[PDB]
Structure 1
Amino acid sequence: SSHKTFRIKRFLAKKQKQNRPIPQWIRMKTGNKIRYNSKRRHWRRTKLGL
């Protein structure tokens, strides 16, 4: 909602910051074995824990 506490806002801030694609230079690292961010979250597909 528009009314929110500081802890909820901070939690949503962290959840925003980690919902981003992997950097391109990661895939050229030695022994990478990572293709894409498998922990990507969409606001309409899956909902947050709170």
Structure 2
Amino acid sequence: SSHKTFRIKRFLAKKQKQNRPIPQWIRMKTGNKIRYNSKRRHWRRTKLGL
């Protein structure tokens, strides 16, 4: 909602920063074995815990 506590807003802030694509240079690293961010979350498919 519009009325939110600081903890809830701070919690939402962290979930927002970590929902980004992996940097491209990562695949160039030796022994990368990572293709894409498997922890991507869309607001409509899956809802946050809180």
- TM-score, normalisation: structure 2: 1.00
**Aligned structure 1 segments of 4 or more residues deviating by more than 4 angstroms:** none
Gaps of at least 5 residues in structure 2 are none
Distance 2:11 2:26 in 1: 27
Gaps of at least 5 residues in structure 1 are none
Distance 1:8 1:42 in 2: 18
Q: What is the CA-CA distance between 1:40 and the residue it aligns to? A: 0.1
Q: What percentage of aligned pairs have identical amino acids?
A: 100
* Structure 2 residue matching 1:26: 3-state secondary structure: helix
- TM-score, normalisation: structure 1: 1.00
**Structure whose residues are more often helix by fraction:** 2
